[PDB]
Structure 1
Amino acid sequence: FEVAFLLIQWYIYGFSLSAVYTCKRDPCPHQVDCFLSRPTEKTIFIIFMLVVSLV
């Protein structure tokens, strides 16, 4: 179960969060920019949870 959850988390999100995201879904126009909320702190806690999972 641990290795399955680690593989799914790598496949969906990766192990970082970018501050600027680009969106191409209807019913928006061609391409819009969307800005996340505190991505640095979430990157730090994602790295901590990854380390705990590996241990």
Structure 2
Amino acid sequence: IISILFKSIFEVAFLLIQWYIYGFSLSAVYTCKRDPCPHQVDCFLSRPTEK
């Protein structure tokens, strides 16, 4: 019983972390506002739809 409970708990925790961090989709264009980049810049990903 403990093993099954821990399996379920880990699954739920990983799902929640993924939802909080990334979500469940990816966009083609990303906006970056981190140094040393001046102001904001546009970056492009690879294979967003397939991922």
Deviation at 1:33, TM superposition (A): 0.2
Q: Distance in 1 between matches of 2:17 and 2:40?
A: 28
Task: Name whichever structure is richer in helix by fraction.
Answer: 1
Report which of the two structures shows the higher radius of gyration computed on alpha carbons.
2
TM-score, length-scaled by structure 1: 0.75
Q: How many residues align?
A: 42
Runs of 4+ in 1 over 3 A off after TM superposition: none
From 21, 24, 27, give the equivalent of 2:33.
24
Gaps of 5+ in 2: 1-9
Q: What value does the CA root-mean-square deviation take over the aligned residues?
A: 0.3
Q: Distance in 1 between matches of 2:17 and 2:41?
A: 28
- Cα offsets for 1:12-39 (capped at 9, x unmatched): 0000000000000000110100000010
Higher RCO structure (Cα 8 Å, ≥6 apart): 1
TM-score, length-scaled by structure 2: 0.81
Gaps of 5+ in 1: 43-55
